Design an enzyme around this catalytic site. Structure first.
Site, PDB file in Angstrom:
ATOM      1  N   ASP A  31      11.255  16.509   6.509  1.00  0.00           N
ATOM      2  CA  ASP A  31      10.144  16.862   5.632  1.00  0.00           C
ATOM      3  C   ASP A  31       9.781  18.326   5.793  1.00  0.00           C
ATOM      4  O   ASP A  31       9.359  18.752   6.871  1.00  0.00           O
ATOM      5  CB  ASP A  31       8.921  16.005   5.922  1.00  0.00           C
ATOM      6  CG  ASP A  31       7.644  16.663   5.438  1.00  0.00           C
ATOM      7  OD1 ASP A  31       7.426  16.700   4.209  1.00  0.00           O
ATOM      8  OD2 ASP A  31       6.879  17.172   6.282  1.00  0.00           O
ATOM      9  N   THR A  74       7.664  17.955  -1.224  1.00  0.00           N
ATOM     10  CA  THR A  74       7.863  19.015  -0.252  1.00  0.00           C
ATOM     11  C   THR A  74       9.327  19.176   0.067  1.00  0.00           C
ATOM     12  O   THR A  74       9.763  20.276   0.421  1.00  0.00           O
ATOM     13  CB  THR A  74       7.113  18.693   1.029  1.00  0.00           C
ATOM     14  OG1 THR A  74       7.843  17.695   1.755  1.00  0.00           O
ATOM     15  CG2 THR A  74       5.748  18.147   0.690  1.00  0.00           C
ATOM     16  N   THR A  75      10.093  18.098  -0.065  1.00  0.00           N
ATOM     17  CA  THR A  75      11.531  18.231  -0.107  1.00  0.00           C
ATOM     18  C   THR A  75      11.980  19.182  -1.204  1.00  0.00           C
ATOM     19  O   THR A  75      13.092  19.704  -1.121  1.00  0.00           O
ATOM     20  CB  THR A  75      12.166  16.854  -0.307  1.00  0.00           C
ATOM     21  OG1 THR A  75      11.427  16.121  -1.293  1.00  0.00           O
ATOM     22  CG2 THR A  75      12.176  16.073   0.988  1.00  0.00           C
ATOM     23  N   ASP A 115       4.984   9.488   4.145  1.00  0.00           N
ATOM     24  CA  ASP A 115       5.324   9.738   2.753  1.00  0.00           C
ATOM     25  C   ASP A 115       5.509   8.434   2.002  1.00  0.00           C
ATOM     26  O   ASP A 115       5.005   8.272   0.885  1.00  0.00           O
ATOM     27  CB  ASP A 115       6.588  10.585   2.683  1.00  0.00           C
ATOM     28  CG  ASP A 115       6.519  11.774   3.597  1.00  0.00           C
ATOM     29  OD1 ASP A 115       5.452  11.964   4.213  1.00  0.00           O
ATOM     30  OD2 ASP A 115       7.517  12.515   3.705  1.00  0.00           O
TER      31      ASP A 115
END
Lengths: 273, 532, 521, 154
Positions: free
Chosen positions: C55, C88-89, C386
């Site tokens: 992440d 966020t990836t 997540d």
């Protein structure tokens, strides 16, 4: 004399309890966080004049040899355990000027009337005061990682083995914060956070005494021009130099975490991860 | 002949301060007008700050030379008096100083320069009143829409202004307030603004009420109240003290239990006494004990600790509550009255950006307005509120003064020439200062054009011409006009474009500029002194 | 000496390029890390520990920098992470690349403001675009959510364990719905406690119908196993606590001193009988416990726990539905610890743990993570974080998006459709942002490692046909794939703030012209 | 700056100058209540409030509307509970008055100070044509007293 001895005994307990930690729990707390030692403040020098009036200031002095030597040892050792493991004391303050004015006193901390000196008019039996880190301690958004990044001493004081910054206490005994010299100063010397001008007033009666016990030429003889009175007033201006351990003037100035994030309370001095 | 520092006099210092001022100007020259570009400063440790308003920038700028600090503090004052013109006013200060200095830089007597400048300001503002445009005839909401989006220009949010200004104007008409019994004063900074990274300003919401940067004390405590039963209480709720020194001495142990009992029952009965009124919402800037927390959960109550003093003041003025430093009565017993309650439709704490902040909807006693900010980073929100902060003031002034001035730099365009002719009136040598005063006053459009990065003079020249034309053929109802644009790089009617500014802005601007140069100009010598 | 005495300043294009470059770096250092074929990174914290995590947020949250916009970029990552968890990836990699082309008009001497002006126009259509190409989904159907979750989680190392987490994430998520807000009930992920214990295996970790405590019975005589106990949450301490008024006693007679000592005994015992009068079974408190009372509570065979963390006490309270008390005399039976299907305290191996299971319809729950090593575990839960987060977002909106870049091309031509129809100088920025969008599937190609250019052109060519919009890029084959069969499905809101955040980044950095250091305050 | 949250402007104001602190009675010498018994609890609480009310009660009884209070930093200042009363009593109030200022104050306003309650009487109560706190600087607020029937030379 009584205060340092109690201050001496207190640190040894935390240091004792710090060393009685089995490796896994420190290993566990280092990774997970949580309370590691909580020294019951009810155990803090329970027989001295700053905890119970069953004592008095006149009481026989607890006979302690190498007091400064042991005070130097146990402070430095304890800080290195904190420094090496970045632990979180609930009894340390970035600027002891805050302890008397500006911090929040929480719950039972509130009775405190700070005399900022050691005088007979103070009622010097008083509770053992530490910060309330309970909100930090049980906060998931302020868990292990966050506290490392912010709360641990080295963030504000610099690394204990690599800082000249003085390290000060909460008002543990007699409502008087301690001022511990930096390790790089060559010793870890402890001081009460007391102003020199308040120190000087301790002699104000005596100055008057000489005024009526000695002749002026005799007083001027030994005190020089002005005698004691001008000396006293002159010394008052020079107290920030002449009555001042430097360690009380060597606290960090660039503050990241600080003292005003949590109130001071009356409670157990404790260290957590 | 003084120790620990020397002196320099005359031109050397004279030009030196000029060099100082010009330095100050260029620092901010690029953040003004609909095409100004906002500044940012790494502090020392990365806590950087992006912002377009110089008053912030200057206040965040360390200064050591005297004269510049005057400008920064002066910049602060106009901010304390207007809020923008920070885009402009300091730029005015140095440049007028620049030209005025140049005259003296030859020989010119400074006091002579001061006097013409004194007249020049007085001359200007009088004509300013002779060129004023009133908003009373105009649509109130429309021009406020116009000036705001005019004010919204040069700011990060200028694209969305229509949403924003509309949001803003509602806020102020929601911050109506009756003044000295003869004024409808509208209090700025009374509106509550909360910044929150996250969603876009597209999703930024105004509160028809108040919003709290606070949370519910007790997790078990309920979360939302559809009722109006609302209280504030400065009086904290803990086990009541002796609060001075009052010692408790026991020679008869038999009642200590009773002693210790009542220690909290006082707080308890105070809990009971206030609860018996049936109040459902309470605030207390003081600390709140868990004993109280438990009791309120039993009530399913709503309570707040450690609320900022000013907001609850707004709350009491909003909800109609009475903030209570304690419980009392004209008779000695501490009593409590429902009449002290504040009232509102519904109160919720809501987690925005995963953090529960408390919302207040529609206090019936006094209508309230608060605004919720949504943005990407914390850097974006805290700046945009400043623009919002300034956004309120300008409209407030427009509300404060039912009169408008067209934006887009028309002012000096008209001023320059009208003074240019007016200079000839005096016949002295001061009209040169008047002429430079006007000449230096021409700076803004030039700054605009360079900030828009095109041929400035020709724009200026055209602006000169039409305004000069605006001083020909006094049949000016169809010859007097006002306006200029930059996005298309050609003049216009800002009046038609809606580009307007508050009169007071420029008014104090010139005067404060007038005073400043006067202070700076009369200087002729500085002397240094090293510290102890 | 005039201005600020050794505080550096800079202006204009060099500033502009510098911010342009740093972000290019900023995005670049992570471009390896998105996609089912991503990589996985391990970090040195400054103080010695290790964190290994894909992440990006934590990675950047674990990044120290000097240039500001990077740190400015940093928070943007954590903010969307905070609000959305993943993306966020991808979001930042979107962001810098947007900037990467965004510069390309700086040499075009075009004032950025218009370029901003188009951007705000651009996003508007983009949001409108996605709403047009969104798909609502039922929320009651578990399996699609499970599909959605694996679709959401087939990016992280727990990929091998999708079945477990998907149900694991779903179960806790479902069981957190606080309906006292009318039909505006809201779930909380702070009552979604996560407990990581090493040892065991992933398969051993499971969702517990209740709470887990890293503490032990204060006294052995209290049973370590109970079916349907009654639980007390005493917010107050269990012992004698200061007379708050600096109280004092002056005895004179002999019996007085002994009398008072009984009185504290008496005071404590007083507390005990008030407790037992409700016939409780389990005692929990955040403070200490008198052993002497604990003798009494032992004498009542009533289970006792001391000094328990408050948030857990809440979740414990939220476990058994009871409410915490600080007043034994004002304790109320409506908070009897009923809602307790099984009480136990197991031995994990060198640690007692408290086992609280089978509440009737519990609202609080902790997930028990039993693995190999805490850094492995800590990595897991981040992915869990997540996983659960998006689900509530799904519980917040039933409208779904097909990812895999499929949506990205959809807007891309859509803006191209907008672009050609929106004549003016601003047109070229408009298409450029569309040009920016295309990189994410492209980036996916590299993480797979395929002929990116050819596939991308075909995909765009594939997406030139209006008849098909679910055509995206497979993670592993690196082939054009319609999403409907592929099933990599995503919450629309996830993508919204993604673009919402992306464009906000753009404008903010664009208005910059200047740098100022050495504030000294 | 004012200490009242609510009182902003006053007309036909009557001014009274008061020196003695308005808080719990503290002897110049060391004094202390001893607590050993039960009804000590409520009575003290109630009686001090009754103490302050009569203070406030008598002060209102004079018919005044504006309070001036000097520094008493050596000892207790004005109690907020009294401020609670005055706010309940809707009385203008000022703390933190300089011992140097009062002579100029009384010279200007014509209200000789009062340092004991019995000494407080309306004969010494000055009154003013108008007095209030102006607000400039946006929020730089300043106290104003214009118009006095007794013209001080100052």
């Amino acid at each position: 004399a009584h205060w340092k001895r109690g201050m001496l005994s207190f640190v040894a307990q935390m240091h004792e309890m710090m060393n009685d930690v089995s490796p896994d729990d420190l290993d566990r707390v280092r990774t997970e966080g949580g309370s590691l030692v909580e020294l019951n403040w009810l155990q803090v020098d329970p027989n001295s004049m700053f905890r119970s009036i069953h004592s008095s200031w006149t009481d026989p002095l607890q006979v302690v040899d190498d007091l400064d030597t042991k005070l130097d040892q146990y402070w430095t050792a304890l800080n290195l355990m904190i420094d090496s493991s970045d632990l979180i004391p609930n009894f340390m303050m970035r600027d002891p000027s805050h302890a008397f004015n500006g911090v929040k006193l929480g719950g039972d901390a509130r009775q405190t009337q700070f005399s900022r000196t050691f005088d007979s008019r103070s009622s010097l039996e008083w509770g053992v005061m530490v910060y309330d880190y309970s909100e930090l301690e049980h906060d998931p958004s302020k868990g292990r990682a966050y506290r490392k990044e912010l709360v641990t001493p080295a963030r504000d004081f610099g690394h204990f083995g690599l800082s000249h910054y003085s390290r000060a206490t909460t008002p543990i005994l007699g409502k008087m914060p301690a001022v511990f010299s930096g390790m790089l100063t060559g010793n870890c010397k402890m001081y009460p956070f007391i102003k020199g001008t308040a120190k000087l007033k301790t002699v104000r009666k005596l100055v008057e005494a000489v005024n009526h016990a000695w002749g002026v030429e005799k007083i001027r003889y030994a005190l020089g021009p002005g005698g004691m009175t001008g000396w006293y007033n002159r010394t008052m201006q020079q107290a920030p130099i002449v009555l001042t351990p430097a360690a009380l003037t060597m606290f960090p100035d660039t503050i990241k975490f600080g003292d005003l994030n949590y109130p001071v309370m009356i409670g157990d001095p404790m260290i957590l991860g | 002949l003084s120790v620990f520092g020397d002196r320099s006099t005359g031109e050397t210092i004279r030009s030196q301060n000029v060099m100082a001022a010009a330095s100050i100007a260029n620092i901010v020259k690029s953040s003004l007008g609909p095409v100004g570009l906002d500044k940012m400063l790494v502090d020392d440790i990365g806590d950087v700050t992006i912002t377009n308003d110089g008053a912030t920038i200057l206040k965040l700028l360390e200064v050591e030379h005297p004269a510049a600090k005057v400008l920064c503090e002066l910049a602060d004052l106009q901010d304390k008096e207007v809020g923008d013109g920070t885009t402009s006013v300091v730029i005015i200060a140095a440049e007028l100083l620049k030209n005025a200095d140049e005259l003296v830089k030859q020989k010119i007597h400074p006091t002579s320069v001061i006097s013409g400048y004194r007249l020049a300001c007085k001359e200007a503002v009088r004509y300013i009143n002779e060129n004023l445009i009133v908003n009373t005839d105009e649509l109130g909401r429309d021009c406020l829409i116009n000036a705001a989006k005019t004010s919204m220009s040069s700011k990060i949010i200028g694209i969305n202004g229509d949403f924003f200004a509309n949001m803003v104007v509602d806020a102020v008409l929601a911050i109506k307030y009756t003044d000295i019994r003869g004024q409808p004063r509208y209090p700025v900074n009374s509106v509550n603004i909360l910044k929150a990274h996250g969603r876009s300003q597209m999703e930024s919401m105004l509160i028809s009420g108040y919003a709290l940067n606070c949370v519910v004390g007790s997790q078990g405590m309920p979360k939302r109240i559809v009722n109006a039963k609302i209280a504030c209480l400065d009086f904290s709720l803990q086990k009541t003290k002796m609060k001075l020194g009052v010692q408790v001495v026991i020679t008869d142990p038999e009642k200590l239990d009773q002693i210790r009992q009542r220690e909290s029952d006082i707080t308890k009965e105070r809990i009971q006494k206030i609860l018996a009124t049936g109040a459902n919402v309470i605030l207390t800037t003081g600390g709140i004990d868990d004993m109280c927390l438990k009791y309120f959960v039993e009530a399913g109550a709503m309570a707040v600790r450690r609320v900022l003093k000013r907001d609850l003041k707004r709350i009491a003025k909003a909800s109609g509550a009475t903030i209570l430093s304690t419980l009392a009565n004209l008779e000695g017993e501490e009593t409590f009255e429902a009449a002290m309650l504040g009232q509102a439709e519904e109160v919720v704490q809501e987690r925005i950006c995963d953090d529960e902040l408390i919302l207040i909807k529609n206090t019936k006693a006094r209508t309230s307005a608060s605004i919720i900010l949504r943005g990407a980073n914390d850097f974006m929100c805290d700046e945009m509120e400043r623009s919002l902060h300034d956004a309120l003031c300008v409209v407030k002034r427009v509300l404060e003064s039912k009169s408008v001035v067209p934006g887009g730099g028309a002012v000096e365009a008209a001023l320059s020439i009208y003074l240019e002719n007016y200079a000839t009136s005096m016949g002295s040598r001061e009209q040169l200062a008047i002429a430079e005063f006007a000449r230096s006053l021409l700076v803004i459009p030039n700054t605009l054009a360079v900030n828009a990065a095109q041929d400035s003079t020709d724009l200026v020249a055209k602006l000169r011409a039409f305004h000069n034309e605006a001083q020909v053929n006094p049949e000016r109802k169809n010859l007097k006009w006002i306006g200029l644009d930059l996005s298309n790089g050609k003049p216009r009617d800002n009046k038609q474009a809606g580009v307007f500014e508050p009169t007071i802005v420029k008014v104090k601007s010139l005067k404060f500029a007038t005073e400043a140069a006067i202070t700076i100009l009369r200087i002729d010598d500085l002397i240094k002194l090293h510290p102890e | 000496l005039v201005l600020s005495q050794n505080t550096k300043r800079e202006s204009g294009r060099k500033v502009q390029s510098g911010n342009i470059n740093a972000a290019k770096t900023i995005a670049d250092i992570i471009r390896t890390c998105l996609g089912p074929k991503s990589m996985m990174k391990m970090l040195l914290d400054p103080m010695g520990g290790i964190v290994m995590t894909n992440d990006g947020n934590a990675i950047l949250r674990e990044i120290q920098v000097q240039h500001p916009a990077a740190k400015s970029m940093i928070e943007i990552s954590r903010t969307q992470d905070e609000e959305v968890g993943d993306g966020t990836t991808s979001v930042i990699i979107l962001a810098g690349e947007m900037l990467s082309v965004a510069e390309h008009f700086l040499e075009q001497q075009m004032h950025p403001t218009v370029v901003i002006s188009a951007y705000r126009k651009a996003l508007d259509d983009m949001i409108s675009t996605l709403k047009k190409i969104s798909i609502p989904v039922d929320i009651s159907d578990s399996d699609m959510m499970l599909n959605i979750i694996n679709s959401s989680i087939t990016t992280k190392a727990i990929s091998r364990w999708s079945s477990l987490a998907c149900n694991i994430a779903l179960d806790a998520v479902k069981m957190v719905q606080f309906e006292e807000n009318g039909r505006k009930e809201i779930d909380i992920k702070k009552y979604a406690r996560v407990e990581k214990i090493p040892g065991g295996i992933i398969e051993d970790s499971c969702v517990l119908r209740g709470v887990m405590i890293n503490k032990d019975v204060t006294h052995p005589r209290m049973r370590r196993y109970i079916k349907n106990p009654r639980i007390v949450l005493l917010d107050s301490s269990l012992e004698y606590k200061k007379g708050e008024s600096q109280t004092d006693i002056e005895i004179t007679r002999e019996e007085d001193f002994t009398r008072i000592l009984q009185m504290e005994e008496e005071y404590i015992q007083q507390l005990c009988e008030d407790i037992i009068q409700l016939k409780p079974d389990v005692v929990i408190t955040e403070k200490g416990i008198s052993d002497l009372a604990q003798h009494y509570l032992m004498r009542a065979n009533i289970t006792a726990i001391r000094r328990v963390r408050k948030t857990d006490n809440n979740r414990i309270a939220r476990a058994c539905g009871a409410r915490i008390v600080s007043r034994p005399e004002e304790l109320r039976e409506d908070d009897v610890g009923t809602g307790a299907g099984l009480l136990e305290i197991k031995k994990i191996g060198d640690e007692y743990f408290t086992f609280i299971t089978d509440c009737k319809d519990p609202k609080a729950c902790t997930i028990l993570l039993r693995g190999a090593s805490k850094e492995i575990l800590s990595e897991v839960e981040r992915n869990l974080q997540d996983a659960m987060q998006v689900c509530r977002n799904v519980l917040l909106d039933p409208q779904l998006v097909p990812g895999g870049g499929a949506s990205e091309m959809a807007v891309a031509h859509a803006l191209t459709e907008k672009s050609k129809a929106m004549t003016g100088v601003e047109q070229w920025p408009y298409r450029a942002v569309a040009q920016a969008l295309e990189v994410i599937p492209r980036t996916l190609i590299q993480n797979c490692g395929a002929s990116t250019i050819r596939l991308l052109t075909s995909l765009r060519a594939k997406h030139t046909q209006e008849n098909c919009e679910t055509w995206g890029v497979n993670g592993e084959t690196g082939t054009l794939v319609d999403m409907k069969e592929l099933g990599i499905w995503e919450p629309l809101a996830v993508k919204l703030q993604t673009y919402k955040t992306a464009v906000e980044t753009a404008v903010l950095l664009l208005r910059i012209d200047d740098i100022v250091s050495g504030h000294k305050k | 700056k004012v200490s009242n949250s609510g009182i902003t402007r006053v007309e036909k104001a009557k001014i009274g100058l008061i020196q003695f602190c308005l808080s719990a009675p503290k002897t110049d010498m060391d004094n202390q209540i001893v607590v050993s018994d039960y009804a000590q609890m409520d009575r003290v609480l109630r009686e001090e409030r009754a103490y302050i009310l009569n203070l406030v009660k008598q002060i209102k009884k004079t018919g005044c509307n504006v309070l001036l209070i000097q520094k008493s930093i050596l000892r207790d200042a004005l109690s907020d509970l009294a401020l609670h009363f005055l706010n309940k009593m809707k009385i203008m109030v000022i703390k933190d008055i300089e011992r140097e200022d009062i002579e100029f104050i009384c010279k200007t306003i014509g209200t000789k100070p009062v340092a004991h309650i019995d000494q407080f009487t309306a004969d010494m109560l000055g009154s003013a044509e108008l007095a209030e706190e102006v607000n400039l600087n946006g929020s730089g607020k300043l106290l104003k007293i214009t118009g006095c029937a007794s013209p001080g030379k100052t």
